[model samples]
Target: TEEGKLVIWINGDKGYNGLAEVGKKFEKDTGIKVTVEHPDKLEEKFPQVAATGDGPDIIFWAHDRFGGYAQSGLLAEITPDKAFQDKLYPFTWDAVRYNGKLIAYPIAVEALSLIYNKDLLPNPPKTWEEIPALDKELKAKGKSALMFNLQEPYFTWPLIAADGGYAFKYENGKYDIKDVGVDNAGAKAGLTFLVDLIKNKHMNADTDYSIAEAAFNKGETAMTINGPWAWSNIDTSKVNYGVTVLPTFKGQPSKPFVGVLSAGINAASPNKELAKEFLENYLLTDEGLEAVNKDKPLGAVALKSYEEELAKDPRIAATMENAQKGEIMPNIPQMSAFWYAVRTAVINAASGRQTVDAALAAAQTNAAAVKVECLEAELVVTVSRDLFGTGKLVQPGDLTLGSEGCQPRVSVDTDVVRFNAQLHECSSRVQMTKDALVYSTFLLHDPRPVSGLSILRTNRVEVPIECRYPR
Candidate 1:
């Protein structure tokens, strides 16, 4: 009987690292040997180990990736009791469900909220139209009204999805890929708002995650949209801040994407019974959930009782309120392609390289090329930079595609620039500015035996001089 053995694979992050201590309780309760391993690149590495029939009994990751893993048969179906399942927010259940089966246990939920500086604005803006006046008022004080990570599609999507824009429509209890919505009227309206903000000098496109956070933390921006992660980092003594739901847009609610963190049982594990008991009886309980939040509050949790207790903290309550007004991020595999396409579109539209309509139309075209079922080939990208601070190089952690012999091809079009890399058949490269120290790597992993090999190419560019702008 494998009653005494259970291993769990978790990502190398502070919140999940807290699980290392919480897991010991299960060991004492059931006399089961519990081993938790924090792996770098766990998302990319776990699939490779799973393919070889060797991995942890349970895996922890974001719920969005679960759809692909479940579709590929890497996850075991979970059927928790109704009482236990009913304790979580109903929307969380939607996040962990793939196809018709529930695959994971929801643990945490995060959504963007309008974080405002109390000194700059005593009251929150109730609607989009309220923002322009705030911008004008704040500019006189040498501050911007609002800002966010302009380059990321994740931040942009909430604005786009507000009225009628959607990544894919969920109908008949499934995501319908045939009806793509990025080019719809709603999405165009969202992009136009951002462009107008840039044109009127309300905010600039150069603001990234770090820049936005720094500005908000320093009270240089009156308001910024961000998740709970920024709460602890902001020096509360210096900046009197509050969090709430985003302002309404065009008389409709501003809906952000709710991302859930969950634990899934590995389909290949032999100790399924013990693992299930550990999660159901111990890990998901109040004791276990509390242990996770001890290090730092990751987000509002799923269990209603635990969440109610956590709501005693005003910040947690605000996060929970914002999340309730949002939509869950779609876990379907097609979402991967949608992210890349929309990111490119947002960048293009913001830079004035293409009209909002033209940019979104191109994004929809790119997203349509993704296979609805399985990926053919896997693409891996590594980005390096000596021009930015620290001169550190960064590579994507788990851009790995699922299934065997899936031949996915990447093409470099007008938007993407080819550098000093050798090409076999098809490839794409994104151009870099001289002042930017960004480098990108495109990796294609082909499992099938083929005569032609996908080749790699590259070029090195120097970093530009630093330009300091007053906050």
Candidate 2:
């Protein structure tokens, strides 16, 4: 089936944003149609469709997913001319790389910062200890000094990292996955600082994203730890707000992870040059960048030359300054463990169910416990006539993809594979997109008795399979 003409899959609905106008403009000049699509379960569907060389030409998404896709062999390395590369920040280029190769085109930067109401707390807190004084002032007027998504590690990292806590060891410019740092002494101290805020009621407890945002929007809370994405929402409440860098913890700068939203090329795309050209001539151009920034202002521009113009909006400039303070999100497969364990510890620490040390102790144990489990899966094929892009309608057994079981089998329902001498429903997982993208994906559900929760991992293995057609 035809997916689209120069399709790019994206997550949110800025339905036909500034980029859509850029696409329209490109079409008038180049006669090349560019389609931006919003699909259900988009994060799961991309890799599934890309496997057979029948997918989108570009991926307009974040850089953290770069490591996952690049390592999976799905991304084409981007080699921009040096002059083109020199236009962006060095950190922006660094995140899209895998094994010393750039796999994505950097576009915008995103990071959390302190968003406060100028009407209430005129100035932001400079350190965590200062928050208690502000809390007392707000408590007098039945208001709270601060509130945030307490369970969210995205917001919690600043407190943790300010004390030298980190998720992984950075050795020789690469992440050492084996050296997880969730339970280090400094990490424990970080947790202690957070628990103090809760115990002393400096920040109200048990708040989630919506709860925190609503409170801040209504001026019930004086401040929030949020990203530029929330600036528009905060704007809606008519609150006189100001954006600034995250407050330091115990005299050290508290910071959030810098996640780059970027443009990536699919390895399987046929229109590689056209895709590359479109990014350079349209998305990377100042016109396109400003168009996007106009629609969604949550940008810390990746381009160095654009900063002065963008800095006119002080809040966006604050986000850019915040990005400089933060480190690029570790783009490694082990980041999964990083999110998991840290989230668990933060939520656990918030609940006060365990000591901060125990909370982090469990975090380290949980992070280290993820042993990989893999499935040796075979995919059965059922191709339609003329599906291979050949003008000639091919014969029933014309396929040459496999060496064994090459003959066509009798008509069947869909496709089949074996596991544990039994047949059942399974999924072909392309990690970022978790669903079964293909007909039947083989999976082994059994976990080894002593492994302590195995991660279900699989590799696309080439195996001979019997071909088929529906009767």
Candidate 3:
């Protein structure tokens, strides 16, 4: 009966609500009707629907799952109209492209960042080794050092990536799946660094997102790896907090899984053109940006749109800068194994269920274990960057970030900065609470000007953009 109808299916609660809002906004703008459907019995119903070629007009899925549908021809290849292409971020463009065809419109993305109590840690630690000393100093003053979600897969990838490790390699500008990097030298180094962190009791791995944020709010934890979802949840009632991209070990900034929400067309749908049209507008139009960014401050990768918006708000600028190190997740048929293996590997290592090496080795083996007989893969790079943001820019004792793991029971005297810290409950992350009320004195040393500071930490590792300080 409907000339133009778009049926969309999505998974999980968070995605459902978000899509619902998007649907409402979408239908309002266009004359087309949208049916946002979430199957009550997804596990049983989704597979049946896909097999029968009776799936919705569009389905919201994870990148890892992209491969399976595309391989089975259940997914339609969509080329976003050229008119809309120029407005989107270059990295985001690559996110939707699979093989040679653009399959979807990426609407949302998520990344991990180092969040810290700005008052407690005016400057966050930049390298892996400095965490110990920073933790000790903060504990001497009675504050937590760091917090992380070892249980959640999204939270831990940054730790590995920060140490110059990655899940896959780009060989001659193509994704060389055969060249597994789970046991790569960089990855092992990263894994060892994580183990050392836990062994030294400088961090807590068992902590979840909720616990980490709560601790940060209560001034119990100092540094944590968190996403943007926790922004409003923060207890701004007391101290000011900050956030920034995850610190790196020796090379480029830690890159996280850029969880993208893309609008995909149904391969079996009779109304393929309509789906592509809607997605084009959804991504490339100014109206779309306004509608999406109204309630949420999600980074809009569009160069002009983002720059214009960011110039008005400095906070948004920081978030965009942090997202620059993002790596678009693979949208191949074997993505399921890719995501599952990495998640399992991270959890296995973090929980001590398996040795870091063993866990990652399992991931490598699992990815290799996939039966990729066909599926028409191009093995393209999909995305690439100048590969900047590597190496730890900040260090412990190099500045006035308190010493949590520092030895000799020596007191770190901050001339004006009054910071306190302690160990988290699970001993995965360190917590530090700062009394912003008092005039805090901490040492600052940068032959360079203080221009680039992390949005998450306030320790000496951070340098305010201001060069003319009353020193």
Task: Give candidate 1's whole-model lDDT.
Answer: 0.69
Q: Give candidate 3's TM-score.
A: 0.67
lDDT of 1 by residue, 1-471 (tens): 133588888765435545766778777777778888877557656666777777889998778778878887888999898988888888788889887899998888988888899888989897876888889988987988998888668787878877778888889977765467898999899888888888788878778877888898888898988876667656553789988778888888787888898889888889888888888777787878877677546688888888878778777777767777778788887676677668767776787866899778756644644322111222332222221223333222212222223233433333221122222221233344322422222232222333365454211221111111112
lDDT of each: 0.69, 0.67, 0.56
Q: What's the lDDT of the predicted structure labeled candidate 2?
A: 0.67
Regions of model 2 farther than 4 Å from truth:
1-4, 11-16, 31-33, 37-56, 199-206, 353-355, 368-471
Give the lDDT of residue 447 in candidate 3.
Answer: 28
Model 2 deviation from native, Cα RMSD in Å: 12.5
Candidate 3 C-alpha error for residue 72, in Å: 2.6
lDDT of 2 by residue, 93-144 (tens): 9878778899999987888889898888777888877888899989999999
RMSD of each: 11.2, 12.5, 19.3
Task: Report the C-alpha displacement of residue 435, candidate 2, in angstroms.
Answer: 20
- In model 3, state the lDDT of residue 169: 74
Off by over 4 Å in 3: 1-22, 28-49, 54-56, 61-65, 108-110, 139-142, 235-239, 258-260, 270-274, 282-284, 303-307, 311-316, 370-471
